[PDB]
Write an enzyme that holds these catalytic residues in place. Structure first.
Site, PDB file in Angstrom:
ATOM      1  N   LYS A 128      11.312 -13.408  30.341  1.00 36.51           N
ATOM      2  CA  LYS A 128      10.356 -14.426  31.996  1.00 36.51           C
ATOM      3  C   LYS A 128       9.422 -15.680  30.853  1.00 36.51           C
ATOM      4  O   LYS A 128      10.306 -16.865  31.144  1.00 36.51           O
ATOM      5  CB  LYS A 128       9.496 -14.069  32.793  1.00 36.51           C
ATOM      6  CG  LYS A 128      10.417 -13.130  34.095  1.00 36.51           C
ATOM      7  CD  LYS A 128       9.329 -13.343  35.061  1.00 36.51           C
ATOM      8  CE  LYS A 128       8.570 -11.964  34.533  1.00 36.51           C
ATOM      9  NZ  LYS A 128       8.835  -9.901  34.146  1.00 36.51           N
ATOM     10  N   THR A 129       8.722 -15.250  29.710  1.00 32.95           N
ATOM     11  CA  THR A 129       8.383 -16.383  29.307  1.00 32.95           C
ATOM     12  C   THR A 129       9.094 -17.449  28.259  1.00 32.95           C
ATOM     13  O   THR A 129       8.696 -17.956  28.178  1.00 32.95           O
ATOM     14  CB  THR A 129       7.058 -15.917  28.208  1.00 32.95           C
ATOM     15  OG1 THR A 129       6.105 -15.553  29.399  1.00 32.95           O
ATOM     16  CG2 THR A 129       6.178 -16.754  27.735  1.00 32.95           C
ATOM     17  N   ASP A 189       1.817 -18.785  32.619  1.00 28.96           N
ATOM     18  CA  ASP A 189       2.404 -18.149  32.158  1.00 28.96           C
ATOM     19  C   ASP A 189       1.724 -16.343  32.794  1.00 28.96           C
ATOM     20  O   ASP A 189       0.357 -16.277  32.823  1.00 28.96           O
ATOM     21  CB  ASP A 189       3.102 -17.377  31.296  1.00 28.96           C
ATOM     22  CG  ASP A 189       2.183 -17.799  30.826  1.00 28.96           C
ATOM     23  OD1 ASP A 189       0.689 -18.321  30.583  1.00 28.96           O
ATOM     24  OD2 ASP A 189       1.818 -16.996  29.559  1.00 28.96           O
ATOM     25  N   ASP A 190       1.995 -15.446  33.469  1.00 26.21           N
ATOM     26  CA  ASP A 190       1.285 -14.742  33.375  1.00 26.21           C
ATOM     27  C   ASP A 190       0.176 -14.756  34.768  1.00 26.21           C
ATOM     28  O   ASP A 190      -0.883 -14.633  34.971  1.00 26.21           O
ATOM     29  CB  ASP A 190       0.724 -13.350  32.477  1.00 26.21           C
ATOM     30  CG  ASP A 190       1.064 -12.478  32.355  1.00 26.21           C
ATOM     31  OD1 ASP A 190       1.465 -11.465  33.817  1.00 26.21           O
ATOM     32  OD2 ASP A 190       1.150 -11.389  31.286  1.00 26.21           O
ATOM     33  N   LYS A 234      -0.590 -29.195  45.498  1.00 23.91           N
ATOM     34  CA  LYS A 234       0.680 -30.181  46.629  1.00 23.91           C
ATOM     35  C   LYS A 234      -0.275 -31.529  47.195  1.00 23.91           C
ATOM     36  O   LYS A 234      -0.686 -31.816  47.630  1.00 23.91           O
ATOM     37  CB  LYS A 234      -0.039 -28.824  48.157  1.00 23.91           C
ATOM     38  CG  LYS A 234       0.742 -28.006  48.499  1.00 23.91           C
ATOM     39  CD  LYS A 234       0.515 -27.142  50.207  1.00 23.91           C
ATOM     40  CE  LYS A 234      -0.876 -26.783  50.364  1.00 23.91           C
ATOM     41  NZ  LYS A 234      -1.181 -25.837  49.275  1.00 23.91           N
ATOM     42  N   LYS A 293      13.638  -6.745  25.928  1.00 24.15           N
ATOM     43  CA  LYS A 293      12.356  -6.997  24.881  1.00 24.15           C
ATOM     44  C   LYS A 293      12.007  -5.007  24.692  1.00 24.15           C
ATOM     45  O   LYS A 293      11.670  -4.808  23.229  1.00 24.15           O
ATOM     46  CB  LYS A 293      10.629  -7.287  25.149  1.00 24.15           C
ATOM     47  CG  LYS A 293       9.416  -7.463  24.094  1.00 24.15           C
ATOM     48  CD  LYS A 293       8.268  -8.274  24.577  1.00 24.15           C
ATOM     49  CE  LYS A 293       7.238  -7.275  23.859  1.00 24.15           C
ATOM     50  NZ  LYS A 293       6.147  -7.840  24.764  1.00 24.15           N
TER      51      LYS A 293
HETATM   52  N1  LIG Z   1       6.747 -37.363  63.332  1.00 21.78           N
HETATM   53  C1  LIG Z   1       7.056 -36.675  62.608  1.00 21.78           C
HETATM   54  N2  LIG Z   1       5.867 -36.479  62.642  1.00 21.78           N
HETATM   55  C2  LIG Z   1       4.885 -35.546  61.480  1.00 21.78           C
HETATM   56  N3  LIG Z   1       4.603 -35.921  60.043  1.00 21.78           N
HETATM   57  C3  LIG Z   1       6.226 -37.061  60.211  1.00 21.78           C
HETATM   58  C4  LIG Z   1       7.128 -37.293  61.026  1.00 21.78           C
HETATM   59  N4  LIG Z   1       7.915 -38.519  60.478  1.00 21.78           N
HETATM   60  C5  LIG Z   1       7.693 -38.026  58.920  1.00 21.78           C
HETATM   61  N5  LIG Z   1       6.578 -37.231  58.966  1.00 21.78           N
HETATM   62  C6  LIG Z   1       6.165 -36.760  57.422  1.00 21.78           C
HETATM   63  O1  LIG Z   1       5.678 -35.391  57.571  1.00 21.78           O
HETATM   64  C7  LIG Z   1       4.340 -35.537  56.690  1.00 21.78           C
HETATM   65  C8  LIG Z   1       2.746 -34.935  57.168  1.00 21.78           C
HETATM   66  O2  LIG Z   1       3.532 -33.724  57.036  1.00 21.78           O
HETATM   67  P1  LIG Z   1       2.099 -32.402  55.645  1.00 21.78           P
HETATM   68  O3  LIG Z   1       2.626 -33.224  54.609  1.00 21.78           O
HETATM   69  O4  LIG Z   1       0.280 -33.584  56.249  1.00 21.78           O
HETATM   70  O5  LIG Z   1       1.924 -31.311  56.029  1.00 21.78           O
HETATM   71  P2  LIG Z   1       0.933 -30.274  56.773  1.00 21.78           P
HETATM   72  O6  LIG Z   1       1.037 -30.294  58.392  1.00 21.78           O
HETATM   73  O7  LIG Z   1      -0.181 -30.973  55.907  1.00 21.78           O
HETATM   74  O8  LIG Z   1       0.993 -29.272  56.195  1.00 21.78           O
HETATM   75  P3  LIG Z   1       0.864 -28.114  55.549  1.00 21.78           P
HETATM   76  O9  LIG Z   1      -1.003 -28.406  55.468  1.00 21.78           O
HETATM   77  O10 LIG Z   1       1.076 -26.251  55.544  1.00 21.78           O
HETATM   78  O11 LIG Z   1       0.735 -28.407  53.160  1.00 21.78           O
HETATM   79  C9  LIG Z   1       4.208 -37.020  55.844  1.00 21.78           C
HETATM   80  O12 LIG Z   1       4.961 -37.299  54.982  1.00 21.78           O
HETATM   81  C10 LIG Z   1       5.387 -37.644  57.505  1.00 21.78           C
HETATM   82  O13 LIG Z   1       5.422 -38.703  56.282  1.00 21.78           O
HETATM   83  N1  LIG Z   2      18.318 -14.960  26.380  1.00 19.91           N
HETATM   84  C1  LIG Z   2      17.525 -14.398  26.206  1.00 19.91           C
HETATM   85  N2  LIG Z   2      16.512 -14.346  27.072  1.00 19.91           N
HETATM   86  C2  LIG Z   2      15.306 -13.473  27.268  1.00 19.91           C
HETATM   87  N3  LIG Z   2      14.630 -12.921  25.956  1.00 19.91           N
HETATM   88  C3  LIG Z   2      15.361 -13.373  25.223  1.00 19.91           C
HETATM   89  C4  LIG Z   2      17.181 -13.344  24.763  1.00 19.91           C
HETATM   90  N4  LIG Z   2      17.375 -13.172  23.805  1.00 19.91           N
HETATM   91  C5  LIG Z   2      16.371 -12.562  22.902  1.00 19.91           C
HETATM   92  N5  LIG Z   2      15.290 -12.910  23.609  1.00 19.91           N
HETATM   93  C6  LIG Z   2      14.225 -11.461  23.426  1.00 19.91           C
HETATM   94  O1  LIG Z   2      13.689 -11.818  24.254  1.00 19.91           O
HETATM   95  C7  LIG Z   2      11.746 -11.981  23.906  1.00 19.91           C
HETATM   96  C8  LIG Z   2      11.708 -12.042  25.683  1.00 19.91           C
HETATM   97  O2  LIG Z   2       9.788 -11.266  24.899  1.00 19.91           O
HETATM   98  P1  LIG Z   2       8.950 -12.172  26.216  1.00 19.91           P
HETATM   99  O3  LIG Z   2       8.012 -11.813  26.162  1.00 19.91           O
HETATM  100  O4  LIG Z   2       9.403 -13.483  26.667  1.00 19.91           O
HETATM  101  O5  LIG Z   2       8.909 -11.387  27.444  1.00 19.91           O
HETATM  102  P2  LIG Z   2       8.494 -11.356  29.096  1.00 19.91           P
HETATM  103  O6  LIG Z   2       8.765 -10.973  30.119  1.00 19.91           O
HETATM  104  O7  LIG Z   2       8.206 -12.173  29.000  1.00 19.91           O
HETATM  105  O8  LIG Z   2       7.149  -9.992  28.690  1.00 19.91           O
HETATM  106  P3  LIG Z   2       6.227  -9.795  29.977  1.00 19.91           P
HETATM  107  O9  LIG Z   2       6.236 -10.219  30.943  1.00 19.91           O
HETATM  108  O10 LIG Z   2       6.200  -8.536  29.361  1.00 19.91           O
HETATM  109  O11 LIG Z   2       5.053 -10.706  28.725  1.00 19.91           O
HETATM  110  C9  LIG Z   2      11.968 -13.167  23.559  1.00 19.91           C
HETATM  111  O12 LIG Z   2      10.964 -13.727  22.311  1.00 19.91           O
HETATM  112  C10 LIG Z   2      13.346 -12.689  22.433  1.00 19.91           C
HETATM  113  O13 LIG Z   2      12.308 -11.773  21.211  1.00 19.91           O
END
Ligand SMILES: Nc1ncnc2c1ncn2[C@@H]1O[C@H](COP(=O)(O)OP(=O)(O)OP(=O)(O)O)[C@@H](O)[C@H]1O
Ligand SMILES: Nc1ncnc2c1ncn2[C@@H]1O[C@H](COP(=O)(O)OP(=O)(O)OP(=O)(O)O)[C@@H](O)[C@H]1O
Ligand SMILES: Nc1ncnc2c1ncn2[C@@H]1O[C@H](COP(=O)(O)OP(=O)(O)OP(=O)(O)O)[C@@H](O)[C@H]1O
Ligand SMILES: Nc1ncnc2c1ncn2[C@@H]1O[C@H](COP(=O)(O)OP(=O)(O)OP(=O)(O)O)[C@@H](O)[C@H]1O
Ligand SMILES: Nc1ncnc2c1ncn2[C@@H]1O[C@H](COP(=O)(O)OP(=O)(O)O)[C@@H](O)[C@H]1O
EC number: 3.6.4.6
Lengths: 520, 521, 125
Positions: free
Chosen positions: B330-331, B384-385, B412, B489
């Site tokens: 993954k890393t 990571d991790d 956010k 790995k």
């Molecule tokens: N009619 C509407 N009512 C409410 N929001 C609207 C409307 N039309 C557009 N929006 C957009 O909704 C967004 C507001 O949502 P907001 O990002 O505040 O989420 P939230 O309710 O705080 O959610 P959470 O806290 O889970 O992140 C604004 O970007 C506004 O542009």
């Molecule tokens: N296509 C590939 N994708 C990923 N790793 C690859 C690939 N080809 C070869 N590898 C080898 O696999 C290794 C994966 O090791 P890596 O530490 O990134 O895994 P990881 O999931 O992060 O381990 P952990 O999550 O346990 O820390 C790469 O560093 C490389 O040596």
């Protein structure tokens, strides 16, 4: 204030003159027959930047007193064990030494003490020895008859009791914000110099400028004038570097003229006034009507605003909005707060307290509410009542101190006949009820989600971004299926789907919408 | 000249324009303009920035530019003397000419420019505070002056005393920012004009290549690199180092080869900051091999989301999560995606650098990284991790709250203004994260699969390079007609472990180990 | 005199017998504590459903006692305090009632002082 010329505290100064100076205007023979003594100090607290120093300067000048001295708050405190009382003793030493030469002819050595909170020992939550020496010097085994203490502060509730006993600092006073006439007077003292040389323009209407300003303090108007003259100089330089016609137009262009308007909305950012950047950050894409619930919520908010405006028995009013996540609750609360046209409005969101402990959050909330208590009208908007508490389903775990600080501040009433309005935003009302916070509020509102296919189609059409055939195909596909999408999620999904080749646009959007949930 | 490059310095042009606008604009106008209403004459300038960024030269060139007397320069705290009152007398002696000119010539007085080298040393116990008060009184006392200019330079802006920062004493503050790529080009061009004048430089050196390669260097560092390369070139002539010295004078023919510069910069100088290397070759090691379809899909999705964040308008914040079973690589994939993003600012926050830090230190470090990401125009940060970022143990379970809250709030927070951002996270315990209610913050997720079918195992083994046709056939005899479940790995570790046996037993040991590791979900 | 005005806002409305009963009980307690000699210390607890007007009745009884020393210890003056600060403040408030011939101390909203919360439970020991 008849001699000072400056206006704004005429009534306050008349009252303070009555309180203390009445003994300084009287037949001296009857004063001697009085047998009484004079005061040893006074206090002055109020909002910052309200000219608490000009008052002291003018009052000292009025009575023909010796030269004053200014001491700032963080001017004495030090970490060393014995380097705090030194300055306190030194300040009184000069008065002590000269007392012997005169004895009875000594004149008042008026002084100014600034930010007494620094040395005060009341931080129960600065050492505890400086105030002892200060009180001893003010009065002890020996009494000094040639001293006077004038203090300054903005947190009058943090001062120790011992510093206000009848023997010392037995009087208090308050400095409040001015009204339209005060702003007019202030604008008449920081701009007369330009008028003298005819730099100002007749088009500049002082009454209009005063009306435009709402809660500007003393420093704000001077800063606005400074910025306006700077902008006028910039315009003059632009004209000079643009084209040369007269070479004497520089003086005419030096006039501030109508740049006051632009400076008002671009050069000054009052702390106690409305803030536009919070609106820009929170209500980003703007409110777009797509259903009746928005209208219902807005009507309820307007009704509550009217109720708080026209109430006498209930100075305190509190509401609470709740709904499912991603329903857009913050924007509606921000709109409701903005459309109240109140003088004071602040948002205590949690994004400004990253990494803080519990005590810091408590202090921040207390400070915000203390600031709200000052103005004659207030509307505080607590953003997230579930992130301040640090709630996590595992456990459960949270912070009790912030819970208490919130529970106590939702019932306290302002002083005398001031008002207040507290709005809230949450997403887990059930846990709030479990915590016994759901009764402290006075009313509750709901914010539903896009639930009907026709509503979704209408909202998408209003947002546009799709053509007639595509929209008709979408309407055909939705049919009678269940819709449980969120506004924020809706926008994000639309934007993500519109990021691939035109050939496959409706397909991916439909796939993502279907993959999402279809029930509560 | 106003070119700002006719001098022997370059790199900061907008700051030069700003100082020209704010400093000498008043003086240009005839005295009639000033006398009309007057103006706030400036007699205070402070300069600071990263150490050794050319601050000293700016003051000298500014002093030489203006048509006035020679400014006075004081080398740090040379004022102090053994006796009492000598320091005050010395500091007063500087202003005698200014007072005399003010008294005699009045308004029509030549400007006085004052240079203070290491002002921080003197201004920041009785002697020091007395000297500070003397300076404060002299600069702004009962009698005002308008024919003096004071310029101070420092590298610790936070140490300068507050009392000296008030308006009227130090009005113009300047920060010397890092040179740009064009600044580096100019530095290199003006740091080798001599050799080109005598054309002793080898054509193998490409200045543009050096400018592209070099990143986050101060001018002094570039000069040191040039001189180190010069020394490397000179070594080629000298021959004796252990016996009596002897030199190859007859050889002559001094040239500056690219190899000399490369060798010198390889092990002579290293930038203090901006070293985003030694991690692009550490986290992603052994390369990325195409052992099946999934890698292509993952890379395509990453590129699509990167493009989405590149040219969007109403989505200034994008987050992704890469989940999967442990030892699935993954890393490496996240690092590859970040590298292919090719953004100005990139940094990887990993727990390896916080072995022992408590909660508050972790929170502060994360906040610092995210603020640094906020600064630039657009950037992509990765973490990571996560389960290691917030110490988690199944028993209890036990974990930390401060780090969780800080992470939750920071996914956010929109970047300032119109800038953009991109966040990628990794983990292998999706269930716990979902139960913590953090999975709703992330926008979309991707899956990283294991090696399942025998054909995939054979393809990966062949691509890596090992065994042979006969051994490969023997392996396929038993592994093809079955199901396998192993991470890449772990496969590398097992191959390396089994490669250490005798020639006639390697395959059996490898198969036994594979049987040992066999499992399924 | 400001405490009584602040805590009592719309006066007292005689809407039934229970108010008279409570006031009579308070008067009896006041008389007993003022007159007797074997019981210098007396106590009483008022409780009921929320939003029933308990603090108002307590303040009215205290004001009708006509004692020389009266004080109220509310929690709203202790926002953000730690446990030790609350203990010190309460001890100081109590220690000023031992230096007078008579006293009457009112402690209100006990559940808020102890820092109660149904989850847990949690509170200050
Ligand atoms: N009619 C509407 N009512 C409410 N929001 C609207 C409307 N039309 C557009 N929006 C957009 O909704 C967004 C507001 O949502 P907001 O990002 O505040 O989420 P939230 O309710 O705080 O959610 P959470 O806290 O889970 O992140 C604004 O970007 C506004 O542009
Ligand atoms: N296509 C590939 N994708 C990923 N790793 C690859 C690939 N080809 C070869 N590898 C080898 O696999 C290794 C994966 O090791 P890596 O530490 O990134 O895994 P990881 O999931 O992060 O381990 P952990 O999550 O346990 O820390 C790469 O560093 C490389 O040596
Ligand atoms: N941004 C830059 N552009 C060009 N040259 C630079 C730059 N920064 C440093 N230099 C080079 O640095 C050399 C001297 O640097 P600098 O002026 O900082 O020296 P200094 O007086 O020893 O500094 P300090 O006062 O910080 O100890 C000059 O040759 C100058 O060319
Ligand atoms: N006969 C009465 N008894 C009690 N309160 C009355 C009576 N008549 C009027 N009130 C009103 O009762 C209000 C005081 O009730 P209050 O809200 O303080 O009750 P409480 O039980 O102390 O509340 P809380 O549980 O919130 O601490 C005052 O506004 C007063 O006007
Ligand atoms: N009521 C007032 N009338 C005229 N000017 C005022 C008034 N209040 C403040 N100012 C202006 O504000 C400036 C700074 O005020 P300051 O003394 O710092 O206020 P504070 O005492 O609250 O710190 C002064 O230059 C003064 O001219």
């Amino acid at each position: 204030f008849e001699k000072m010329g400056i206006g704004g505290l005429d009534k306050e100064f008349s009252d303070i003159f009555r309180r203390a100076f009445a003994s300084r205007v009287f037949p001296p023979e009857i004063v001697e027959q009085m047998g009484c003594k004079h005061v040893k100090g006074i206090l002055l607290y109020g909002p910052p930047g309200c000219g608490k120093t000009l008052l002291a300067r003018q009052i000292g000048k009025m009575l023909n007193a010796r030269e004053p001295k200014v001491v700032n708050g963080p001017e004495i405190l030090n970490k060393y064990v014995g380097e705090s009382e030194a300055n306190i003793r030194k300040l009184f030493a000069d008065a002590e030494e000269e007392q012997r030469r005169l004895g009875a002819n000594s004149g008042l050595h008026i002084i100014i003490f600034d930010e007494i909170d620094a040395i005060c020992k009341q931080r129960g939550s600065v050492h505890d020895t400086v105030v002892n020496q200060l009180l001893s010097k003010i009065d002890g085994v020996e009494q000094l008859n040639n001293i006077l203490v004038i203090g300054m502060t903005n947190r009058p509730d943090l001062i120790d009791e011992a510093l206000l006993r009848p023997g010392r600092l037995e009087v208090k006073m308050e400095i409040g914000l001015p009204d339209e006439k005060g702003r007019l007077q202030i604008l008449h003292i920081h701009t007369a110099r330009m008028r003298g040389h005819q730099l100002l323009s007749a088009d500049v209407d002082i009454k209009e400028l005063a009306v435009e300003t709402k809660n500007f303090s003393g420093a704000e108007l001077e800063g606005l004038v400074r910025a306006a003259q700077s902008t006028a100089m910039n315009r003059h330089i632009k004209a000079s570097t643009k084209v040369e016609v007269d070479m004497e137009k520089a003086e005419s262009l030096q006039v501030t003229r109508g740049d006051f308007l632009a400076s008002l909305e671009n050069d000054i950012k009052p702390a106690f006034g409305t803030n536009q950047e919070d609106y820009a950050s929170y209500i980003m894409n703007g409110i777009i009507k797509w259903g009746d619930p928005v209208t219902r919520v807005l009507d309820d908010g307007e009704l509550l605003v009217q109720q708080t405006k026209n109430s006498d028995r209930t100075p305190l009013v509190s509401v609470l909005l709740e709904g499912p996540p991603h329903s857009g609750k913050t924007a509606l609360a921000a709109k409701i707060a903005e459309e109240s046209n109140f003088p004071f409005i602040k948002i205590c969101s949690p994004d400004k307290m990253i990494g803080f402990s519990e005590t810091a959050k408590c202090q921040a909330m207390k400070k915000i509410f203390d600031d709200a208590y000052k103005s004659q009208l207030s509307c505080v908007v607590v953003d997230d009542i579930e992130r301040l508490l640090d709630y996590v389903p595992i456990g459960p775990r949270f912070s009790n101190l912030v819970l208490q600080a919130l529970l106590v501040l939702l019932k306290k009433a302002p002083p005398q006949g001031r008002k207040l309005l507290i709005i809230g935003t949450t997403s887990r009302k059930d846990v709030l009820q479990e915590m016994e916070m759901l009764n402290a509020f006075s009313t509750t509102i709901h914010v539903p989600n896009i639930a009907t296919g026709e509503q979704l189609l209408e909202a998408l059409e209003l947002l546009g971004n799709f053509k007639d055939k595509e929209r008709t195909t979408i309407a055909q596909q939705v049919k009678g299926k269940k819709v449980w999408i969120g506004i924020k999620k809706l926008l994000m999904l639309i934007e993500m789907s519109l990021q691939m080749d035109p050939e496959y646009r409706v397909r991916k959007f439909l796939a993502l919408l279907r993959e999402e949930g279809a029930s509560p």
